[PDB]
Structure formats: structure tokens, C-alpha cells
Ligand binder design. Structure first.
Ligand SMILES: [Cl-]
Ligand SMILES: [Cl-]
Ligand SMILES: [Cl-]
Ligand code: NA
Ligand code: NA
Ligand code: NA
Length: 106
């Protein structure tokens, strides 16, 4: 198998230096897109025509052209509790772009 898909990735905000302004949560599930893009290319990675063309060119010239990439293609928000300019804990209900919703080959 080993095709491109969504897998678990728990991110700790202190590990990445963001606990300076994110009070809560301490960690969250961000997910990660793992695996490769290579033929045969499954339906669920929704391959673009350019990703297909690039994969073919990469097979013919592996050292000159790169492969198609397994990336997040749709993201979801989370809620974070942050300290505002006044230092008061404030809720950001939909903090966009924080968690993978779908993966794909691009
Ligand atoms: Cl396309
Ligand atoms: Cl919001
Ligand atoms: Cl946002
Ligand atoms: Na982490
Ligand atoms: Na080559
Ligand atoms: Na809601």
C-alpha cells in the first residue's frame, strides 16, 4: 500500500514555541499527510492533471524533475484560548487552517 493518506499527529504548543500566546489547549490533533504519490494513484488522493503529468515525467527523469507531493488539500479550524493585547484570556472559536481534513497528491 503506502499511498498518501491522513494520519495522526498530536502537536504540543510548547514544543513549537506557541505557548507564549496560546493558553489552551496544551496539545491538539493536527493530523499529517503521510505516504507517497506514485502509480497506481488511488481515487482518494484526488490527483490533479499536473500531479499526474509530473509523476510521469519524474519516472522518466528521476534526477531532473521532482515527484508529486502528498499534502493536505483541505484544512479544518480549532478553538484556541489566547491572551489578547491586554493579557486577558480570549476565545478564538474558529482558528482556521490548523487540522488536516483531506490529503491529496499535488
Ligand atoms: Cl486537475
Ligand atoms: Cl472565530
Ligand atoms: Cl483564523
Ligand atoms: Na508536538
Ligand atoms: Na534523470
Ligand atoms: Na459552531
Amino acid at each position: 500500500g503506502s499511498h498518501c493518506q491522513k494520519t495522526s499527529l498530536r502537536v504540543n504548543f510548547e514544543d513549537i514555541g506557541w505557548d507564549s500566546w496560546i493558553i489552551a489547549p496544551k496539545e491538539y490533533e493536527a493530523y499529517e499527510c503521510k505516504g507517497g504519490c506514485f502509480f497506481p494513484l488511488a481515487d482518494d488522493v484526488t490527483p490533479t492533471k499536473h500531479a499526474i503529468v509530473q509523476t510521469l515525467v519524474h519516472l522518466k527523469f528521476p534526477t531532473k524533475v521532482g515527484k508529486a507531493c502528498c499534502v493536505p488539500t483541505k484544512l479544518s479550524p480549532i478553538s484556541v484560548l489566547y491572551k489578547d493585547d491586554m493579557g486577558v484570556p480570549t476565545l478564538k472559536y474558529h482558528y482556521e487552517g490548523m487540522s488536516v481534513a483531506e490529503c491529496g497528491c499535488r
